[PDB]
Amino acid sequence: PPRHNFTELPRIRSERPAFELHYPHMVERMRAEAHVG
Amino acid sequence: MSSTQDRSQLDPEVERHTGVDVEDVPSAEWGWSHMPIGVMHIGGLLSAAFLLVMMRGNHVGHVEDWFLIGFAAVIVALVGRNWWLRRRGWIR
Amino acid sequence: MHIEARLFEILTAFFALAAVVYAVLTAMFATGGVEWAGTTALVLTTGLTLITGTFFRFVARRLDTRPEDYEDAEISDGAGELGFFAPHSWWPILISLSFSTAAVGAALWLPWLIAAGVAFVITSVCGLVFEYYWGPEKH
Amino acid sequence: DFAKLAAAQGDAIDSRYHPSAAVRRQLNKVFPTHWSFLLGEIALYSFIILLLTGVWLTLFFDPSMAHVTYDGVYQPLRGVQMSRAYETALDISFEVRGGLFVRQVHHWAALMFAASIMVHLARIFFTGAFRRPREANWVIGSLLLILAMFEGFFGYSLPDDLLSGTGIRAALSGITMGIPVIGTWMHWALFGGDFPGEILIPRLYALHILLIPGIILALIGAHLALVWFQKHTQFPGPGRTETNVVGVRVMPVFAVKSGAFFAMITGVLGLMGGLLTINPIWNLGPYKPSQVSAGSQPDFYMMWTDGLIRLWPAWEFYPFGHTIPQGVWVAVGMGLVFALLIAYPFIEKKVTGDDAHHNLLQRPRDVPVRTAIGSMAIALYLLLTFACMNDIIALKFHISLNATTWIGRIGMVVLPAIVYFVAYRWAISLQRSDREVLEHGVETGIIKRLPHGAYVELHQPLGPVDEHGHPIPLEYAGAPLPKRMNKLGSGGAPGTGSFLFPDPAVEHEALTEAAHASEHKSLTALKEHQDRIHG
Amino acid sequence: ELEARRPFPERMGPKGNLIYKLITTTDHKLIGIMYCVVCFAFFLVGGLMALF
Amino acid sequence: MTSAVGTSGTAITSRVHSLNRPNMVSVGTIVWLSSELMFFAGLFAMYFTARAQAGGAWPPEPTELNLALAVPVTLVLIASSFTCQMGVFAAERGDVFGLRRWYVITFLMGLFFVLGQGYEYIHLVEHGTTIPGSAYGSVFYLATGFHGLHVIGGLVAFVLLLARTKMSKFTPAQATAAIVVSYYWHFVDIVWIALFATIYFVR
Amino acid sequence: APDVAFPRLNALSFWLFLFGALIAIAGFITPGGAADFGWTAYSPLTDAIHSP
Amino acid sequence: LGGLSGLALLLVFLFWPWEYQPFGSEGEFLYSLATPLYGLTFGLSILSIGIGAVL
Amino acid sequence: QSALLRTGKQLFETSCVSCHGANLQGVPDRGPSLIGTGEAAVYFQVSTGRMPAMRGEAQAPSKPPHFDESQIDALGAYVQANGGGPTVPRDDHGAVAQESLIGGDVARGGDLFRLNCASCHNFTGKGGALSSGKYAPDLGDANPAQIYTAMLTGPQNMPKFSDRQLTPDEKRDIVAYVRESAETPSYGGYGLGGFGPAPEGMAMWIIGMVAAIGVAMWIGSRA
Ligand SMILES: CC(C)=CCC/C(C)=C\CC/C(C)=C/CC/C(C)=C/CC/C(C)=C/CC/C(C)=C/CC/C(C)=C/CC/C(C)=C/CC/C(C)=C\CC1=C(C)C(=O)c2ccccc2C1=O
Ligand SMILES: CCCCCCCCCCCCCCCC(=O)O[C@H](COC(=O)CCCCCCC[C@@H](C)CCCCCCCCC)COP(=O)(O)O[C@H]1[C@H](O)[C@H](O)[C@H](O)[C@@H](O)[C@@H]1O
Ligand SMILES: CCCCCCCCCCCCCCCC(=O)O[C@H](COC(=O)CCCCCCC[C@@H](C)CCCCCCCCC)COP(=O)(O)O[C@H]1[C@H](O)[C@H](O)[C@H](O)[C@@H](O)[C@@H]1O
Numbered sequence A: 001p002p003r004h005n006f007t008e009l010p011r012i013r014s015e016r017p018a019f020e021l022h023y024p025h026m027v028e029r030m031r032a033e034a035h036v037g
Numbered sequence B: 001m002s003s004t005q006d007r008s009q010l011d012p013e014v015e016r017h018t019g020v021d022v023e024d025v026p027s028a029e030w031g032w033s034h035m036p037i038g039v040m041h042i043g044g045l046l047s048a049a050f051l052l053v054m055m056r057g058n059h060v061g062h063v064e065d066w067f068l069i070g071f072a073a074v075i076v077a078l079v080g081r082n083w084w085l086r087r088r089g090w091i092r
Numbered sequence C: 001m002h003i004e005a006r007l008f009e010i011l012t013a014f015f016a017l018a019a020v021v022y023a024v025l026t027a028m029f030a031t032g033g034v035e036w037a038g039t040t041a042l043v044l045t046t047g048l049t050l051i052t053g054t055f056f057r058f059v060a061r062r063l064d065t066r067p068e069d070y071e072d073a074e075i076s077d078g079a080g081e082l083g084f085f086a087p088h089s090w091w092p093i094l095i096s097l098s099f100s101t102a103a104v105g106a107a108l109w110l111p112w113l114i115a116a117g118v119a120f121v122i123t124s125v126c127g128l129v130f131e132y133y134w135g136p137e138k139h
Numbered sequence D: 001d002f003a004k005l006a007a008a009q010g011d012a013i014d015s016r017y018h019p020s021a022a023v024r025r026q027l028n029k030v031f032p033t034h035w036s037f038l039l040g041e042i043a044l045y046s047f048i049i050l051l052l053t054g055v056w057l058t059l060f061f062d063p064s065m066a067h068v069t070y071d072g073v074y075q076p077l078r079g080v081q082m083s084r085a086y087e088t089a090l091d092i093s094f095e096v097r098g099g100l101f102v103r104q105v106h107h108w109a110a111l112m113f114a115a116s117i118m119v120h121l122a123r124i125f126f127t128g129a130f131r132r133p134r135e136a137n138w139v140i141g142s143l144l145l146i147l148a149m150f151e152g153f154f155g156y157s158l159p160d161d162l163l164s165g166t167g168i169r170a171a172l173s174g175i176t177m178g179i180p181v182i183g184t185w186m187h188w189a190l191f192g193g194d195f196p197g198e199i200l201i202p203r204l205y206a207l208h209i210l211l212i213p214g215i216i217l218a219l220i221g222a223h224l225a226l227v228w229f230q231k232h233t234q235f236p237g238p239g240r241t242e243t244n245v246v247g248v249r250v251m252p253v254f255a256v257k258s259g260a261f262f263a264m265i266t267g268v269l270g271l272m273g274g275l276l277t278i279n280p281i282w283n284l285g286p287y288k289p290s291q292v293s294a295g296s297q298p299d300f301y302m303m304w305t306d307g308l309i310r311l312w313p314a315w316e317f318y319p320f321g322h323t324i325p326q327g328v329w330v331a332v333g334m335g336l337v338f339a340l341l342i343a344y345p346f347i348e349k350k351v352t353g354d355d356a357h358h359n360l361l362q363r364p365r366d367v368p369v370r371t372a373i374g375s376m377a378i379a380l381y382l383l384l385t386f387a388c389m390n391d392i393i394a395l396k397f398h399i400s401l402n403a404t405t406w407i408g409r410i411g412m413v414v415l416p417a418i419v420y421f422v423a424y425r426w427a428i429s430l431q432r433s434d435r436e437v438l439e440h441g442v443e444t445g446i447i448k449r450l451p452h453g454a455y456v457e458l459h460q461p462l463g464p465v466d467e468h469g470h471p472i473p474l475e476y477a478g479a480p481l482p483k484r485m486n487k488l489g490s491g492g493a494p495g496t497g498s499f500l501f502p503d504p505a506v507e508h509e510a511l512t513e514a515a516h517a518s519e520h521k522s523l524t525a526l527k528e529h530q531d532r533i534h535g
Numbered sequence E: 001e002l003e004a005r006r007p008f009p010e011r012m013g014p015k016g017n018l019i020y021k022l023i024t025t026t027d028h029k030l031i032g033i034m035y036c037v038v039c040f041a042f043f044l045v046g047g048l049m050a051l052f
Numbered sequence F: 001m002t003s004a005v006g007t008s009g010t011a012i013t014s015r016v017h018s019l020n021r022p023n024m025v026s027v028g029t030i031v032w033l034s035s036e037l038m039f040f041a042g043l044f045a046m047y048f049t050a051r052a053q054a055g056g057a058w059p060p061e062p063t064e065l066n067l068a069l070a071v072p073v074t075l076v077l078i079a080s081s082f083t084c085q086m087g088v089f090a091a092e093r094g095d096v097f098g099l100r101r102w103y104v105i106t107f108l109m110g111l112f113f114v115l116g117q118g119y120e121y122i123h124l125v126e127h128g129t130t131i132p133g134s135a136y137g138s139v140f141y142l143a144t145g146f147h148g149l150h151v152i153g154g155l156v157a158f159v160l161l162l163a164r165t166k167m168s169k170f171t172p173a174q175a176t177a178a179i180v181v182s183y184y185w186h187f188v189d190i191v192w193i194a195l196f197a198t199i200y201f202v203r
Numbered sequence G: 001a002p003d004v005a006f007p008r009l010n011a012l013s014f015w016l017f018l019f020g021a022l023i024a025i026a027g028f029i030t031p032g033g034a035a036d037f038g039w040t041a042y043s044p045l046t047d048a049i050h051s052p
Numbered sequence H: 001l002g003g004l005s006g007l008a009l010l011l012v013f014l015f016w017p018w019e020y021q022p023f024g025s026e027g028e029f030l031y032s033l034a035t036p037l038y039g040l041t042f043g044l045s046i047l048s049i050g051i052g053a054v055l
Numbered sequence I: 001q002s003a004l005l006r007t008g009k010q011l012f013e014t015s016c017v018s019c020h021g022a023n024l025q026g027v028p029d030r031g032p033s034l035i036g037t038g039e040a041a042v043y044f045q046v047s048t049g050r051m052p053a054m055r056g057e058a059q060a061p062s063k064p065p066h067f068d069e070s071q072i073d074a075l076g077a078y079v080q081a082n083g084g085g086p087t088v089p090r091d092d093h094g095a096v097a098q099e100s101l102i103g104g105d106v107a108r109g110g111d112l113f114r115l116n117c118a119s120c121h122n123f124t125g126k127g128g129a130l131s132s133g134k135y136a137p138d139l140g141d142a143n144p145a146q147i148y149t150a151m152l153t154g155p156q157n158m159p160k161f162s163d164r165q166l167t168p169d170e171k172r173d174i175v176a177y178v179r180e181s182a183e184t185p186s187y188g189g190y191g192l193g194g195f196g197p198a199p200e201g202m203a204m205w206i207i208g209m210v211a212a213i214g215v216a217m218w219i220g221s222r223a
């Protein structure tokens, strides 16, 4: 990590900011199946 | 802002063209910066030899000799590792 | 800081309940009445969490919703001047060494090494605290 | 009319003699104002205090082994056979007003003299104040340190005492008499015969009040004259070059601050002579060969020799019908230590190759190998010093005495190497820190960039800044760099009123504006002088 | 259209760059690494006791 | 070095802008004080166990508490807390010298409290009760003397903060430092109120 | 976050851990040894009378 | 302060219960801090003078 | 006395039979036999607390006593009856003598101390180190009976000074010197412990040298 941990910060929406950052298509999916359990 | 930059011309006089370089020791030109590796290797070997030789003495104890053996062994191991790595070009 | 305060409020509720029930069930149904050690410890950990939660609640009511607390908060919203975070400093190791010299003086009952460790600790804490306030040397 | 008297006396002085030019030269001589350059002054002032207290002590001390029963005032030692030296030391302690204080401040001054000589030696060695010029100054300073060591050795041995007499019996007798070819001959010629010879203390008294202090005074005169006429070297800085001395003139500032420092040093010595007990000879009974204590240590300056004696592993050689005791080992060790200390500048110049006339010091970080070697030597010295104290270390800090002895034995070859490596790497990393500060500016508080969540420390460049944010890196100039905006013009103007109450705003503004103007003037003067010299 | 990288990342680093950081370390990341190494050293020390 | 890369008039500033955000220094101080509360909880547990195991006469016959000297000292500590809060108000304002005055009188009254506690210690030791002398003596001395050590630490913090204010210009950083030192002093006086009510009144 | 709240404090925490840990291990070098009483260090066994 | 401490040194040296006191004797406490008082007064006087000069 | 013997036996049976086996015979490799040690040995050792010993190490350290004076006397009487040996001194009333053991002569006591005691303890009774983890402890805690009984029975790695070797008058003088040196105030300031060179050098280097260096840093200018 760069000193001070970051040169950027993604849109923080859920408990997986990096997963949303790296896989934008999943963003809708992570919400659709969330409640199904 | 309340600081003035410094201009320094120290008299120089080995010319540092061989030995250590600024990339390794930034102030190589400003003072003695290189100790030949042979000096340190031989110093470590002689320190280990002295530790081993101190086993011969007027002490009925044995943990003393074992401590000497351990310290001499680690010194020799460090010297051997350094020498081997430098022989191979700092590999492994 | 609503959630930060509410966490400690929940802890306070639970610890107060634990202290009360322990005190009651130890005053009665125990061999020698109130235990007086567990009871006090539970009461004052309730106090710990109560102090922290009360301060957090005061701050939550004093401060408007921060970006951190606000869902749907953009990074630009919080972007700005973060405060002073201390850069490199070698005073912490000196403080630790001074406190260790006081601790060994306490262990090995050496009043002279306690006295010096404490002096050492005062000096190093002064250095740490004054590190970023010692004005330029005035000659 | 004090002004008239002063003018008349000046005219009389300049008529009888003609010291105007020389006195002006002395007054105008410039001395660098670095704190580390007062370390030698500490030793000089402690020496002066030593002389002043030693005269008082000689007025009351009687050196002799002539046996006497005390019959004095100290009850716990009454009717006990003792030497006249011990009896008169007890008389100084008890039956002379302020004698205990005078002898205590004398011994404390001796300890400070040794300690300040050691610190001054560290300063000069680590800053390279010995190369090309001043190498002879270093040599005579090493002789001075050795003389001070043995002077204190004879001093605390002067009052014939159980502790100090045991120390004498160990070192002066055993080591001297163990030396192979002439050991016994040196012993008998020093002691006028066997160890308790009736002339030892008178001889040491002569050596300690006149002979060795006379040589120390002569060598201090040579040292100070050399420093005076071989202008004091200085650290690299804004206007400081190899052909100038930047500092303050002797008369107005340097003289007053040196006198004040002398006053404060003698105050510290007097405070310690009062508040701290040193060498309670009354507790330490009179010397008797059959009696001894468990401590049996010399002063901290000879503690390293004693520790060498303790640690060296009992190696004795027996040639044809002869013995070579372990004392010769420590004697040769001391000889090597002193030879290396005296000959270091020449050893360093032979090794490196630098015979250039050096007037600008070099920061210890800038010379990793020499600072590493000095750290290694200081580590060895500390190891030996604590080995000499292993008895009390073992007693108080619960560690077996054999364990302490063998810790010293192993460390004296392990600890020097560890400290050498650590000091070398530490110096190089200090250089790396200086370079990072040069190329990135000083560090400050963190800021979160506007568009994105980048975190940047928001440095502050120390030089011209490129068209964009990043600055033009500066080149290292051998001088310390400010690593805290604390120490620059940042948050340094508290209300100048007082501790309890403010001052009028007009006065505060006048004061702060005048101070800022003075800082600007000083910095501009340094900058312009630097430009003129290098352009 | 191509990047000039090193054949391999820097293995260790220049002499004397860590020793002073450790003393003056104020980066949590380095401190966390110091914790892990030092804590693990005590695991080996404490673990050696279990073998005895 | 044109003007500065960091557009700040203080090399050290508030660790976060406290107007909109919590003060990190205050939060950390409050948490640490809540921990010191548990330290004193351990001490209280020791004292209460000794009290419970006492055979009816909790303060043994040799020991006798001196309310005449214990009421003035606690009153002085309460006064010190009030003056410390006044100094906090000064620090919230830009009143450097008002803060200094209030904290100086607070330090003086805290030193008076420490000296009064020492006097009561000397009197108690003279009249029998001692740490090794009795369980009551030992628990009482541990509790009250650890509190006295905390008061000494608060005095050291006061003088140290005053030196800091002397050496650097007053800023929100120093104001927050004064605020947290006052938090420590208030915690100390609160635990003293608890200890007084326990040792003397409740017994 | 870029760093911890008090990054000089967490540096002190590590060094307090390291040096605090070492002086506990230091019981071994003493002739008596380290602490006899178990990790729990129960009261009567720990007082000066027992395990002195 | 330097001058007052110098006068204190003078007065203490001239008038203080110096002289050895055997043991557990009335005046032993005064004797024990006799020399410390000499040193305290002298050192404080000259140290204060030096501090004044430095200031 | 019958009840004193019974009390000593009861204390012995629940204190030390695990390492000084019942019948006072010593447990091989755990503790020596107490036959012949006498009442003085028991008094000194138990009163100093060394004997409720919870480790076998280089030396048994001192500690708070586990028995009060009456129980100390009971144990001593039991051991004396079983083995028979030296007895602790007592005054006219019957209590263990404390002031009666202060010999009149202190110069003689100091000379004897230096010849015999200072050998390992100190010039003035501070502690001293010994071969392998052992050490001579500071004598400032010991009371006159404890010092006298320590001489009378060499506790551990300490020579046993019989009455013939050191007549009770000589032991009383040594006790007087020990107490006097321990209770005597340091003339000339704070005696840094009792060891001259080492505490004096540390105090120099820490108090005087830091003061000098700090004053030099104040006066001079960093550069
Ligand atoms: C019971 C009892 C007997 C008690 C007493 C104890 C006892 C026996 C003795 C101590 C008693 C005394 C007399 C103590 C005080 C000692 C003393 C003379 C202190 C002077 C300090 C003082 C009072 C200062 C007052 C403040 C003030 C206005 C100062 C400015 C004016 C003064 C005094 C200037 C003095 C300048 C000074 C130190 C000159 C020293 C002369 C010498 C030997 C060398 C000069 C010199 C120096 C100082 C260098 O640093 C130097 C550096 C590099 C190259 C060369 C030199 C060099 O030649
Ligand atoms: C300046 C100090 C730094 C030194 C740096 C050098 C580091 C290397 C240290 C070398 C350690 C050597 C240890 C061995 C030594 C040895 O051989 O001795 C033994 C005792 O073993 C031990 O404990 C070993 C303990 C080793 C711990 C070393 C700790 C290092 C510390 C000192 C580092 C902190 C330094 C602080 C710096 C302060 C800075 C100041 C500015 C046995 O004695 P003994 O006791 O007679 O044992 C008998 C049985 O044998 C027999 O069976 C049985 O029958 C019994 O008789 C039994 O007694
Ligand atoms: C800065 C300048 C100021 C210098 C300090 C000056 C202090 C002046 C003190 C007041 C005047 C002199 C008092 C002399 C009365 C007196 O002597 O003071 C003893 C105390 O002694 C102790 O314990 C020590 C108590 C702790 C406080 C003193 C500690 C100061 C040290 C730290 C100064 C040196 C620096 C070293 C730095 C260390 C760190 C190195 C990295 C007290 O009696 P006591 O305690 O019972 O002594 C036992 C006999 O009884 C008993 O028999 C005998 O057997 C013994 O056990 C004896 O101790």
Ligand SMILES: CCCCCCCC/C=C\CCCCCCCC(=O)OC[C@H](COP(=O)(O)OCCN)OC(=O)CCCCCCCCCCCCCCC
Residues within 6 Å of the ligand: B060, B061, B062, B063, B064, B066, B067, B069, B070, B071, B074
């Ligand atoms: C990682 C290693 C892990 C090693 C861990 C082992 C720990 C166990 C040690 C002691 C346990 C308590 C026993 C205590 C008694 C000793 C046992 C015994 O009796 O063993 C027979 C002879 C002496 O015979 P002695 O009758 O004692 O008499 C003699 C004179 N009279 O020693 C021998 O040959 C055998 C050697 C015995 C111990 C030597 C251990 C010392 C140090 C080892 C290496 C240090 C390395 C340092 C590295 C920098």
Ligand code: HEM
Residues within 6 Å of the ligand: D047, D050, D051, D053, D054, D055, D057, D058, D061, D089, D092, D103, D104, D106, D107, D110, D111, D113, D148, D151, D152, D154, D155, D156, D157, D158, D159, D208, D209, D213, D216, D279
């Ligand atoms: C040059 C550096 C000197 C050093 C390092 C030194 C060191 C010492 C020391 C440590 C003592 C022991 C004091 C004690 O145990 O109470 C002592 C005693 C003594 N010194 Fe020096 N001294 C020096 C110079 C002088 C001078 C110049 C004189 C005479 C003018 C002198 C005269 C005496 C006398 C007479 C004693 C005996 C005092 C006693 O037995 O208590 N000394 N010295």
